[PDB]
Symmetry: D2
Subunit: 347 residues, 4 copies
Amino acid sequence: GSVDSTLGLEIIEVVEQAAIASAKWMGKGEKNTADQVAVEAMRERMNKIHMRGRIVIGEGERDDAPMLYIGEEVGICTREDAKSFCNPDELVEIDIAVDPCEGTNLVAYGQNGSMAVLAISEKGGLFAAPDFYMKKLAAPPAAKGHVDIDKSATENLKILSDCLNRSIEELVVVVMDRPRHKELIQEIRNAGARVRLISDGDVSAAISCAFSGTNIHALMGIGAAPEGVISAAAMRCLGGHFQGQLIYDPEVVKTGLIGESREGNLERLASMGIKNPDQVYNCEELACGETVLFAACGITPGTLMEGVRFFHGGVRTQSLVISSQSSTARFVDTVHMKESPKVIQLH
Amino acid sequence: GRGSVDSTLGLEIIEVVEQAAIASAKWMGKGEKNTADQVAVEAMRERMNKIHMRGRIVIGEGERDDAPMLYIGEEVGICTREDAKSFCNPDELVEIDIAVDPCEGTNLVAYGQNGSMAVLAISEKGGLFAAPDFYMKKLAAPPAAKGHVDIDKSATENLKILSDCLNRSIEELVVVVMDRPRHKELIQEIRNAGARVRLISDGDVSAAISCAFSGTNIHALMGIGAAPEGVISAAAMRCLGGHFQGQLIYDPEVVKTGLIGESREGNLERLASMGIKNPDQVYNCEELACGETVLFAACGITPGTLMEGVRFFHGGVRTQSLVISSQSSTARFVDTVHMKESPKVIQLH
Amino acid sequence: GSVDSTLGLEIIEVVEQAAIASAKWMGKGEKNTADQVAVEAMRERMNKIHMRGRIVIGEGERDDAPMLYIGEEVGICTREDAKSFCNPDELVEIDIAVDPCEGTNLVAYGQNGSMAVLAISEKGGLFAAPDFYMKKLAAPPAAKGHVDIDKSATENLKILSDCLNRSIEELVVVVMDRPRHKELIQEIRNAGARVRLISDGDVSAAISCAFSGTNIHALMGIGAAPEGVISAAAMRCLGGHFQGQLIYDPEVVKTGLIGESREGNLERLASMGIKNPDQVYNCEELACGETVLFAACGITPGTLMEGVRFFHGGVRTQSLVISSQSSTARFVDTVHMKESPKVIQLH
Amino acid sequence: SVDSTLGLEIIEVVEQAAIASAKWMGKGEKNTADQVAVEAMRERMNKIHMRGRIVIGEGERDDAPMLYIGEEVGICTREDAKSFCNPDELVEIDIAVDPCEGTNLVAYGQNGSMAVLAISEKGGLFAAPDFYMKKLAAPPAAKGHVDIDKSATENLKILSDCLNRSIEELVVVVMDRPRHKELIQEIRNAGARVRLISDGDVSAAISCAFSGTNIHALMGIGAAPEGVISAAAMRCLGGHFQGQLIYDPEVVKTGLIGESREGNLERLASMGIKNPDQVYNCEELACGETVLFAACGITPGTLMEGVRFFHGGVRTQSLVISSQSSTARFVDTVHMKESPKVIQLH
Ligand SMILES: Nc1ncnc2c1ncn2[C@@H]1O[C@H](COP(=O)(O)O)[C@@H](O)[C@H]1O
Ligand SMILES: Nc1ncnc2c1ncn2[C@@H]1O[C@H](COP(=O)(O)O)[C@@H](O)[C@H]1O
Ligand SMILES: Nc1ncnc2c1ncn2[C@@H]1O[C@H](COP(=O)(O)O)[C@@H](O)[C@H]1O
Ligand SMILES: Nc1ncnc2c1ncn2[C@@H]1O[C@H](COP(=O)(O)O)[C@@H](O)[C@H]1O
Ligand SMILES: O=P(O)(O)OC[C@H]1O[C@](O)(COP(=O)(O)O)[C@@H](O)[C@@H]1O
Ligand SMILES: O=P(O)(O)OC[C@H]1O[C@](O)(COP(=O)(O)O)[C@@H](O)[C@@H]1O
Ligand SMILES: O=P(O)(O)OC[C@H]1O[C@](O)(COP(=O)(O)O)[C@@H](O)[C@@H]1O
Ligand SMILES: O=P(O)(O)OC[C@H]1O[C@](O)(COP(=O)(O)O)[C@@H](O)[C@@H]1O
Ligand SMILES: [Cl-]
Ligand SMILES: [Cl-]
Ligand SMILES: [Cl-]
Ligand SMILES: [Cl-]
Ligand SMILES: [Cl-]
Ligand SMILES: [Cl-]
Ligand SMILES: [Mg+2]
Ligand SMILES: [Mg+2]
Ligand SMILES: [Mg+2]
Ligand SMILES: [Mg+2]
Ligand SMILES: [Mg+2]
Ligand SMILES: [Mg+2]
Ligand SMILES: [Mg+2]
Ligand SMILES: [Mg+2]
Ligand SMILES: [Mg+2]
Ligand SMILES: [Mg+2]
Ligand SMILES: [Mg+2]
Ligand SMILES: [Mg+2]
């Protein structure tokens, strides 16, 4: 069969529950608990779906991460005892990329920009990125294919200028506040563009480029690779620009392991089946399948989505769900009515 | 042992109301209220027939052999096939009753006017009052007022009660009433009592449900509208904890159905025949939508209080829907950008 | 001595108080009462401003309309000893077009699209429209000068399609629901556009054209002339397209005059010194002053502005105020705190 | 009496300051972001027919060139004022300014920064010294019921009852500072959620006043002048706001080389502050008969969206509050600079 049309809706509840869980730890100074409860909620809700999924991006390798590890099977239809209950569409093998708590320290500190997020494609349709750093360029649909990761920041800004029909001074670039980004940040400033420095969470940033209204027009710089794939899934559905390139030279940025060399990482990467380490991937290559689904729900408030709010009588969440199948981008504002609220606010 | 209504149905109905709304919206302002109606009907039906469910229409366009589509009794959904046990699971095979109003405010759509929507409600078999095509006196009010106002009380007394419940003056209340001659005295009374009023030319489903949300600046619906619209309204209010009561009105002196030589005595016979023992009965919304599970879904056609209208732009379409489920206990606003042809610009809002 | 910059701000309170007054009559079935209280409030509030105004568009002639009649002086600096208490900027002579309750029957019925509105310019800067009908064409800035009131609805729709970069099916035209538009409406329908038929209030209709987000892209057809001028004032500041042409032929439309004749109407027109009755005006002609101010506040809810809301402890209004002097379009969301409210809503 | 018109004119003051400062969003120059805002605000203020004295601002005349303590601002401070200013324009007023609140938020392009000011008749605003101030901000529903002298734990219980929601349904803003370690731990232990901010507690304080911000209290120590400016908004809104000067280096340090508790007290006495430990009421920090408050977002925040630059213009969002007209005004302004062919409704 083919990826069940219905899955594109069902993931709403996946990211919603994971975000609600993690959001209870907002500002409580426990990034690992914030992460853990989101992992658990996401895993529980996924296992209630009639699907046949494999984690290809997640919390770690099988023996580092107990839940949502790479290779893990999730979905009612992965159980031999239950397979008989699944229809042919539900039995289609799909690959899943999860990030139950994007911005664990954002949550721990109660700062903006965190979310519970996942992407899905049929088997093989999502790049199973290693836990390496990744050089990224995200930009809006109007700049897609025009800007390019190999060009300088200065040139890309000029191109964005022409594509978005506005001055460089009327552009905003998001860059992670990291020592690895000093020269880059300086270059963008000298070119005339405004900047947002973020402490964490460059999935939100990348995707914010797609929507006129966010006052964010590009993401430049190095973040984490698994995150990049998840971002690219959103951007491929939205027609947004997203390119990535693995960084493995510890001179540029370091993972922190006591290794710790370009040769060593090159060795690990080769043995992971990555033939060209310096390869540039466009958005269609990082998320390559025939069907791509993406779901995010805000934990703390952010550019695309409101944060989780707890009030007398319930919870309110905001999610963004994108499906290449229905070709839709849905914002879902959910009032979770917990104990018969006497007042229900419109917004 | 039974299946339970599939949790996934509460999300799939999003696409049902969206596709219906979109179709109808193409006819906004074209002065064809039947066309605007028919395309909505067809699109809602098609989208339902792709769902793994076993539905029976109990509120719809008319009787079989009269209405061609979504007639009373019509079977909808894939699990309605004879082969179904082979292709559907126990949750999906649960018999469900469905109330539809694919185009509520058909004339609003024809004139390009506010307040029309594609709407539907669901429950287990027998879980929705299969209302006849008669008029219904209604009282809708917000959750804070539930059980405190009452449909048999005068408008004057309900307003005082609302005033206490919503902690504001009668001058700070807004009541919706259909602009109809049958409401001359009622409107006069609301005016005398000091409340402000919104008169509507059509579409009292939106009016009733607007009462449930703070921010609509609508606090009650009073008066008489169509009965089936009342049930669909009640389904939503039951899930939200809102107040909704209804009472069949079958008296031509009060309101006429357009029947020839229509009479109260005539109307009762027709009502008796349908197994309606007490024509003067007052139902609250738990009785109008009494099933174990209740789902409600709406999508704006033209703009209104709760939902933006359908918008067509270069590269796609944008819809807003309200979907409510007693099962997940949720109220969902769904803002969907339908990307039809690779839009170079996508607006956040 | 030039129009006081500050007047651009003060007119916020003018429309606010007028709209609040009228709003108390929402749904009350009295369209003259709703009108009269807006008139009085707008006048009272104008008479507290240090300005020197003359009404050129208003409620009627002296010895007929009691308030805001043609020629009425309004403002503190119209007084005999004004040079004593008013500065030179405040003593500049300004002409003022008022429509204190635009959509009197909308208010009476509690229906959408009514507002309190006024426009201001130096003396001579606003066309003193007679009380005749006016054929109008409004469209967005990107269409300015490309569409034309003398072209057919069909031709204009084509031009709009090109200017707004969308199909005719993706266009929405507002036309007043009137027998006189039977044919115009049929043509728009045949051309493939969607339509909003309004029962009253073509001021809101015209200006909605100027703002992306309203899903309204043109106003076509005949309305009242003074309303047109006030519309043009706003459109000239926004760079929107607005043309108008007086209509005085009874076969086309009737002002309800007894034994009304076209030729009889021409006499009245000539009498006011209108040389060419068939003249087409663009908005720069209808609002030709060096300085143009416009202010509007929603009475009932509408496309551009939320209506007046009364709640426990206050009132909430939304206004739109535009100035060619400061070159600004301001949306003003005001919470009027009446009773030390215990709860203040963000929105 | 204070001119009714001033309550509107201050819209342009904060808008212009904000716009100038926003040009430096993320450029890494907190002092530039600061300077340009200071200049635009001063320049705009000097076009107003008012008789203003700065009681809170950039520093002493010797230290700070613009908007220094004591500076006269406004057309009606001119020697010829009687001849071209009416009596209301000639009323002496005091002014607290903070042209760029969150200089570093701007430099990093981070949320929470604003151009802000408050105004009262002469004597109407506490001319705070540049010392620290313990603060408690809360919504109108809690005004008088919470108290700054109670523990965070007590206040949270009181908040819960006043706001009719559980402590877990509360969110408390606290500045991310070593001085707040215990404070934060206590709030966490009581079960409330927390938003930690790197800077910008003016926004934090005032967000408690509006339902919909999902912020319910500010607790902790920030800068005192910012506190007065906050009090002015809260006094007009019916919000709870208390402050108390903190002047012991043991608690928090100002960086004075010979900074000592006794050192700071002598400084306080000199300024005419009789009781350094006095707990100030909202009505006492902004005690004038008439209070005005104006703010405009620089970067985005809880109450006000940031300055946006686009093709053909600029968009700002301001909050302007007046005890005189008893209004809270959100002002969303499209600044049309180059005849924009496209104008967004929002
Ligand atoms: N042409 C425009 N007219 C008015 N406001 C605009 C315009 N373009 C952008 N804005 C404002 O700036 C925000 C961000 O725009 P953008 O940088 O295109 O994402 C929008 O949501 C509007 O508030
Ligand atoms: N306490 C309040 N403070 C400020 N605005 C309010 C308040 N209550 C209601 N409003 C405004 O009035 C609208 C309608 O409120 P409601 O009539 O209660 O549905 C709200 O969406 C707000 O814009
Ligand atoms: N490119 C777009 N992407 C998503 N939604 C849009 C787009 N253009 C218009 N819309 C929606 O349609 C509304 C009206 O657009 P317009 O007809 O240009 O006034 C907007 O406020 C959006 O809700
Ligand atoms: N009773 C309610 N019903 C629905 N949503 C709510 C309710 N109360 C709060 N919210 C949401 O939470 C936000 C912040 O509320 P609060 O914490 O009271 O400021 C609101 O703007 C809504 O999005
Ligand atoms: O912090 P680093 O090592 O520079 O990596 C940045 C990555 O971390 C993130 O900020 C996520 O943080 P968490 O792992 O704490 O959730 C991503 O957004 C980004 O890809
Ligand atoms: O117009 P009537 O005969 O008074 O009936 C009112 C009913 O019609 C409606 O306005 C909808 O009318 P449509 O059938 O034209 O869609 C309902 O909202 C309302 O209940
Ligand atoms: O109803 P008519 O005679 O066609 O006049 C149309 C004019 O009336 C208006 O609807 C205003 O109506 P009101 O005079 O009742 O305020 C204007 O918007 C429009 O220009
Ligand atoms: O940074 P400190 O010394 O803890 O002081 C906090 C004060 O600084 C502010 O964050 C403003 O910072 P800036 O001085 O950079 O504008 C205020 O919000 C707060 O009152
Ligand atoms: Cl990494
Ligand atoms: Cl790089
Ligand atoms: Cl790409
Ligand atoms: Cl309320
Ligand atoms: Cl005379
Ligand atoms: Cl900072
Ligand atoms: Mg994680
Ligand atoms: Mg992450
Ligand atoms: Mg990290
Ligand atoms: Mg129908
Ligand atoms: Mg209907
Ligand atoms: Mg009807
Ligand atoms: Mg009038
Ligand atoms: Mg009018
Ligand atoms: Mg009329
Ligand atoms: Mg400053
Ligand atoms: Mg500061
Ligand atoms: Mg600081």
